[PDB]
């Protein structure tokens, strides 16, 4: 089940793999944020496994945020 | 981290294949002969770390091990412009330079003599690999060095790396040419034994098939060994493009090969290449569609494996994977699969679900591709048994003729008997029969 | 009008020179002169000499500044108040009685307000305390420890001192480069972008607020400030034992100091972990990671 | 005030290294061959008093001491354009000019003969030094003059400045070339004895390792002694940039070296330099990142020490200090350290916490830097024992044959016995064992009786 530290650990693991995969785009990695659930417990979203709690956040820059509407981002996340 | 692949080039034929493979890989990745990425190779989209190691932030060195029992070939490789491309710490060369004398038993004994040095090299390369998938061995099964040393190396790798994957690029002897190595079937038998017992997948490279393709398809009147090695390196490059250009699927070698080998014995793969053109026929870029591509691929002239015509067994494909590179329309791929099934252009196993897998892959960005669309076919086809049956027949003919066994009896592995060759021949016969069964519906009950 | 005003402030009021001086004194950018100053101070403390003498301290400060920064030497003034060492157990905290004053000219004194000067002085004092701890750990001479017969215990004490020094140096480097140097570069860039005097004042205030936050001066970091003070006191006791040498620091006392250091380090790590997990100081996670970077997991 | 450093150049090799160092330092600081600051040397941010003294109102003289037992090298230095760079009162030259005959003991006896002159030179440099930290000795360990003179200098520095630190730039014998001086291992042993007993830090410069690095990194097939001295001078300049360009870190010698020497016995340092470029490859200013810089530094081809591949001992770095010069982003340094740890680019001691320290320093403003970012690596690595083990094996090979020992037997220190050499061999053996132990968790008890 996901923990409050698991989100940080997962984002760190993603950055570490990116560097290992030589994905050195420091502009994309900060725009990409991995979401998970709080260890405290929806309550976290009470994911039975960390895989269920994994989400992606993307920093849309202006003016392109007009294109990546919240519903579009939600569909992309689904 | 990438799943690093160590390339092992063994004996004269294997070392030539390895050298041409490294040349092709360097050309595809835009790596200078010293292992440095060329300034024009600014497209960092290739995955060198799968097959190459970085010497610096810019210089990629192939994770390749060049192994010979004779110093002439290793020195000739070290005398090429690409001598500095490979990491020298991954190169183990036999000091005696005498080779194995085309004796498999001698090659195995030499491997045992170089066991410490070879395993030190292997361990050093493994420690330099963050997430090593396995080793790729390039060798001939007919000689002494590439064959005997290949069997010894396979045994020692299985003992030392029992949890690591072992893929081989095994150059099989030409079966249409009379081999001067009368003990080649013994060498071939030992290599097939080691692949059966200690390898998980054996990629068969038939020098007979290479010569046949060069003559009939490449319009090469006298195919050089170098030209065959360059064709093999091109084929390997096409097979590795999807590894070098990461995507949604087939992101690892084991993930790619898992679908092709249903059983540990069913590790005999057939190859196909696209676009297939005669050396003279490079000129006309045909706007081939995925349906047209598959149709040309379905022509035996476009398959990168020359399997004999078995007339007795209704040989069929066990599985097919098509890796297509270049501009591909998905609707054309769908129509291609539809037409192939409708036209029954391939016979599949009747005992289980079977299809032609299709992979679309990017081309290396550092290598300019002259072809809009390229393709690799990987297939498991029962007609490969006709090659295996021919190898078995040659093995039986040599054992029944005791041909060249006196030279093997000089080496400890074959000093007292050739029983390992006869057991290998029997295992290969059982393998041929099983491959024939896999062409049949009774494969569902095979091994029950 | 604002462009003309900013040009006048830059040219006639030496604003860039004033910012460079601020870096030299509050951020101890004059590392050679401030190093010689703090070395003389730490030597006086080690020699148990009276360093808390405002006249002696001011004379040494004026000599140090006049040697390397004579123009700034006339604007910089240092005072020393005797710090009650019984309350401030850390030797770095002995300097807390020091009050540095800088003569800011008009109209620049409008920018360097008494509250701005107080914040600058707090930063200078923090840097001085860090430098004092650094020198105290660096000035530990091995010959001072050679007197004790327990070669294995002496070696273990030396290695523990090395580890503690490495940890403290990592924290100091985090503060200086990742906090102080990075914030200095950011401040310089913002000052370059400063369009008006009110904008410049706001930039300076933002810089000061950022330093105060990174200096754990915010209430939200009061627990972190206290943990840092505890670690500094442990470091000061370690430095005192190093200066006394192993002949005075017995193997039982060396082991006790090592145990106390490990316990303080564990407590600090747990506090940092709680703060990172709270997300309140995610940048400190990099500082926390750096302090745990290369430290063996004891 | 600057912490002045006296540079001691000992024997032919040491004096050549000192001469090339003074030439390079003069060029980097805009100091004329006469000791005058060039008009282009407008950056008054450098601490000349650390390395130079003022001889007159215009001439800055390096705090450099040129010491030889043979007059040829001292005369050649005094015949160079840099003759005026060094303070002449700090230069002691043996009147007899005969050298030590490749005998360390002879060099020591000559030092004793020049003891008064040498200590007068040292005292003259100390009085010219505002805050003298100690002496820097440049010498070869394989000869007689540089080795014996180095041992004498170490003894006299220990006697005169017993509470001051003594760092040395010690040129170690080439281990890949067969030395014609069969007693060089005896000379090397006596020099190692003096470094262990009377020096506080010995930086080993192996001419074989220098040649190997020149081949692999500078693409120089045969590094000359002059070329090696110029490379060493470049390294010294980079190491002194933080003295000439004061910054956040390494503003003092003790602050710089404190992180490198965990125990008094673990005083054998390995060095690294960055960027390492071949002379032809200066052209392309590569936008190297801190990670890219560290990766190039991590290349053995860029390490200025050729440690053998010990297959039996899992040699590791005891400590690493990276001194980075040039434009450095603190966040880039932090990410670089993170990636280095994640990539396990350095093996640490198993008996204690160890890491690669990274210091960012400004470059000297008076020396135009062709590189946006430059770097020094200082490392303590257990694989250096393989150099020490090789030296011990060479000593045993020479001592067991008593080869060329008659030249040392001419000198009183080795006239009756080689007990100083045997004690040196025993101390070096214990040091090698501890360095191998220092790769192991049992280093906590390493060196305990």
UniProtKB/Swiss-Prot annotation, chain A:
Localisation per UniProt entry: Cytoplasm, Cytoskeleton, Microtubule organizing center, Centrosome
Tissues in which the protein is found: Ubiquitously expressed.
Membrane-spanning residues: none
Signal peptide positions (record): none
Subunit structure: Component of the gamma-tubulin ring complex (gTuRC) consisting of TUBGCP2, TUBGCP3, TUBGCP4, TUBGCP5 and TUBGCP6 and gamma-tubulin TUBG1 or TUBG2. TUBGCP2, TUBGCP3, TUBGCP4, TUBGCP5 and TUBGCP6 assemble in a 5:5:2:1:1 stoichiometry; each is associated with a gamma-tubulin, thereby arranging 14 gamma-tubulins in a helical manner. Gamma-tubulin at the first position is blocked by TUBGCP3 at the last position, allowing 13 protafilaments to grow into a microtubule.
Disease linked to the protein: Microcephaly and chorioretinopathy, autosomal recessive, 3: A disorder characterized by congenital microcephaly and chorioretinal dysplasia associated with poor vision and nystagmus. Variable ocular anomalies include microphthalmia, retinal folding, retinal detachment, optic nerve hypoplasia, absence of retinal vessels, round areas of chorioretinal atrophy, and attenuated electroretinogram. Most patients have mild developmental delay and mild learning difficulties.
Function text: Component of the gamma-tubulin ring complex (gTuRC) which mediates microtubule nucleation. The gTuRC regulates the minus-end nucleation of alpha-beta tubulin heterodimers that grow into microtubule protafilaments, a critical step in centrosome duplication and spindle formation.
Family per record: Belongs to the TUBGCP family.
Name of protein: Gamma-tubulin complex component 4
Name of the gene this protein is made from: TUBGCP4
Full-sequence range covered: 383 to 477 of 667
UniProtKB/Swiss-Prot annotation, chain C:
Keyword Cytoplasm recorded: yes
UniProt GO BP: cytoplasmic microtubule organization; meiotic cell cycle; microtubule nucleation; mitotic cell cycle; spindle assembly
Quaternary structure (record): Component of the gamma-tubulin ring complex (gTuRC) consisting of TUBGCP2, TUBGCP3, TUBGCP4, TUBGCP5 and TUBGCP6 and gamma-tubulin TUBG1 or TUBG2. TUBGCP2, TUBGCP3, TUBGCP4, TUBGCP5 and TUBGCP6 assemble in a 5:5:2:1:1 stoichiometry; each is associated with a gamma-tubulin, thereby arranging 14 gamma-tubulins in a helical manner. Gamma-tubulin at the first position is blocked by TUBGCP3 at the last position, allowing 13 protafilaments to grow into a microtubule.
Designated name of the protein: Gamma-tubulin complex component 5
Keywords attached to this entry: Cytoplasm, Cytoskeleton, Microtubule
Organism: Homo sapiens
Main localization (coarse): cytoplasm
Keyword Ion transport (UniProt): no
Family statement drawn from the similarity comment of this UniProt entry: Belongs to the TUBGCP family.
Known tissue expression: Widely expressed, with highest levels in heart and skeletal muscle and moderate levels in brain.
Subcellular location: Cytoplasm, Cytoskeleton, Microtubule organizing center, Centrosome
GO cellular component: centrosome; ciliary basal body; cilium; cytosol; gamma-tubulin complex; gamma-tubulin ring complex; microtubule; spindle pole
GO molecular function: gamma-tubulin binding; microtubule binding
Gene name for this UniProt entry: TUBGCP5
Function: Component of the gamma-tubulin ring complex (gTuRC) which mediates microtubule nucleation. The gTuRC regulates the minus-end nucleation of alpha-beta tubulin heterodimers that grow into microtubule protafilaments, a critical step in centrosome duplication and spindle formation.
Curated annotation (Swiss-Prot), chain D:
PTM: Phosphorylation at Ser-131 by BRSK1 regulates centrosome duplication, possibly by mediating relocation of gamma-tubulin and its associated proteins from the cytoplasm to the centrosome.
Gene3D superfamilies assigned: Helix hairpin bin, Tubulin/FtsZ, C-terminal domain, Tubulin/FtsZ, GTPase domain
Keywords, ordered alphabetically: Cytoplasm, Cytoskeleton, Disease variant, GTP-binding, Lissencephaly, Microtubule, Nucleotide-binding, Phosphoprotein
Major localisation: cytoplasm
Residue numbers bearing the Phosphoserine modification: 131
Impact reported for residue 387 to P: In CDCBM4; the chaperonin-dependent folding and hence the yield of monomeric gamma-tubulin is compromised
InterPro entries per the UniProt record, alphabetical: Gamma_tubulin (IPR002454), Tub_FtsZ_C (IPR008280), Tubulin (IPR000217), Tubulin/FtsZ-like_C (IPR037103), Tubulin/FtsZ_2-layer-sand-dom (IPR018316), Tubulin/FtsZ_GTPase_sf (IPR036525), Tubulin_C (IPR023123), Tubulin_CS (IPR017975)
Stated family: Belongs to the tubulin family.
Reported function: Tubulin is the major constituent of microtubules, protein filaments consisting of alpha- and beta-tubulin heterodimers. Gamma-tubulin is a key component of the gamma-tubulin ring complex (gTuRC) which mediates microtubule nucleation. The gTuRC regulates the minus-end nucleation of alpha-beta tubulin heterodimers that grow into microtubule protafilaments, a critical step in centrosome duplication and spindle formation.
Name listed for the protein in its UniProt record: Tubulin gamma-1 chain
């Amino acid at each position: 089940p996901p923990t409050a530290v698991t989100e940080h650990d997962v984002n760190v693991a993603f950055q570490q793999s990116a560097h290992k995969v030589l994905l050195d785009d420091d502009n994309l990695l900060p725009l990409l944020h991995l979401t998970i659930e709080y260890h405290g417990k929806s309550p976290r979203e009470a994911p039975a496994s960390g895989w269920a709690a994994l989400g992606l956040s993307y920093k849309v820059q202006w003016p392109l945020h007009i294109l990546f509407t919240p519903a579009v981002l939600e569909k992309y996340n689904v | 981290m990438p799943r690093e692949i160590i390339t092992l080039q063994l004996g004269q034929c294997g070392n030539q294949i390895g050298f041409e493979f490294w040349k092709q890989l360097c050309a595809e990745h835009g790596i200078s002969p010293e292992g440095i990425v060329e300034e024009f190779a600014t497209e960092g989209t290739d995955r060198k770390d799968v097959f190459f190691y970085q010497a610096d932030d810019e210089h990629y060195i192939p994770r390749a091990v060049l192994l010979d029992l004779e110093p002439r070939v290793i020195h000739s490789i070290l005398n090429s412009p690409y001598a500095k491309l490979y990491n020298p710490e991954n190169i183990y060369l036999s000091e005696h330079g005498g080779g194995a004398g085309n004796n498999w038993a001698s090659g195995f004994s030499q491997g045992e003599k170089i066991h410490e040095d070879i395993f030190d090299i292997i361990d050093r390369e493994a420690d330099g690999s963050d997430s090593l998938e396995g080793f790729v061995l390039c060798h001939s099964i007919a000689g002494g060095t590439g064959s005997g040393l290949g069997s010894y190396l396979l045994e020692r790798l299985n003992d030392r790396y029992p949890k690591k994957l072992v893929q081989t690029y095994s150059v099989f002897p030409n079966q249409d040419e009379m081999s001067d190595v009368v003990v080649q079937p013994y060498n071939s038998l030992l290599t097939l034994k080691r692949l059966t017992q200690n390898a998980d997948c054996v990629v068969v490279l038939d020098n007979t098939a290479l010569n046949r393709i060069a003559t009939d398809r490449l319009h090469i009147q006298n195919p050089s060994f170098s030209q065959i090695n360059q064709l093999v390196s091109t084929i390997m490059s096409a097979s590795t493009t999807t590894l070098r250009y990461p995507g949604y699927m087939n992101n690892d070698l084991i993930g790619l090969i898992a679908s092709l080998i249903p059983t540990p014995r069913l590790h005999f793969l057939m190859t196909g290449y696209t676009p297939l053109t005669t050396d003279q026929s490079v000129a006309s870029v045909r706007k081939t569609t995925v349906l047209d591509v598959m149709r040309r691929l379905l022509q035996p002239k476009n398959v990168m494996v020359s399997t004999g015509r078995d007339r007795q067994t209704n040989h069929c494909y066990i599985a097919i994977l098509n890796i297509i590179q270049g501009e591909v329309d998905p609707t054309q791929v769908h129509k291609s699969l539809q037409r192939i099934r409708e036209r029954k252009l391939a016979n599949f196993i009747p005992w289980g679900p079977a299809s032609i897998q299709v992979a679309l892959s990017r081309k290396s960005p550092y290598l300019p591709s002259a072809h809009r669309v390229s393709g690799l076919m990987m297939a498991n086809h029962t007609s490969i048994s006709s090659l295996f049956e021919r190898t078995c027949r040659q093995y039986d003919k040599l054992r029944k003729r005791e041909a060249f066994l006196e030279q093997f009896r000089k080496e400890d592995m074959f000093k007292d008997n050739f029983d390992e060759m006869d057991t290998s021949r029997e295992i290969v016969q059982q393998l041929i029969d099983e491959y024939h069964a896999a062409t049949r519906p009774d494969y569902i009950s095979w091994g029950t | 009008c604002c462009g003309n005003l900013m040009q006048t402030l830059k040219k006639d009021y030496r604003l860039v020179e004033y910012l460079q001086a601020m870096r030299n004194f509050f951020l101890m950018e004059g590392g050679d002169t401030m190093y010689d100053f703090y070395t003389s101070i730490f030597d006086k403390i080690r020699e148990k000499e009276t360093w808390q003498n405002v006249s002696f301290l001011n004379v040494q400060l004026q000599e140090a500044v006049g040697q390397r920064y004579p123009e700034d030497s006339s604007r910089l003034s240092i005072s020393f108040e005797n710090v009650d060492t019984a309350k401030k157990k850390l030797p770095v905290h002995i300097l807390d009685g020091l009050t540095l004053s800088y003569k800011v000219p008009w109209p620049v004194d409008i920018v360097i307000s008494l509250e701005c000067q107080k914040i600058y002085n707090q930063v200078f004092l923090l840097l001085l305390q860090i430098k004092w701890a650094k020198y105290s750990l660096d000035v530990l001479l091995f010959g001072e420890l050679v007197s004790t017969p327990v070669r294995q215990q002496i070696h273990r004490m030396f290695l523990l001192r090395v580890k503690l020094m490495h940890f403290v140096n990592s924290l100091h480097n985090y503060i200086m480069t990742r906090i102080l140097h990075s914030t200095g570069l950011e401040f310089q860039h913002q000052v370059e972008e400063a369009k008006d005097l009110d904008q410049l004042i706001k930039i300076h205030y933002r810089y000061l607020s950022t330093i105060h936050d990174r200096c754990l001066l915010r209430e939200k970091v009061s627990f972190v400030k206290e943990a840092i003070m505890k670690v500094l006191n442990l470091a000061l006791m370690f430095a005192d034992g190093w200066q006394a040498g192993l002949g005075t620091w017995r193997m039982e006392s060396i082991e006790k100091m090592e145990s106390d250091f490990k316990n303080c380090h564990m407590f600090l790590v747990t506090i940092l972990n709680k703060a990172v997990c709270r997300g309140s100081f995610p940048h400190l996670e990099s500082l926390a990671l750096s302090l745990m970077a290369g430290m063996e997991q004891s």
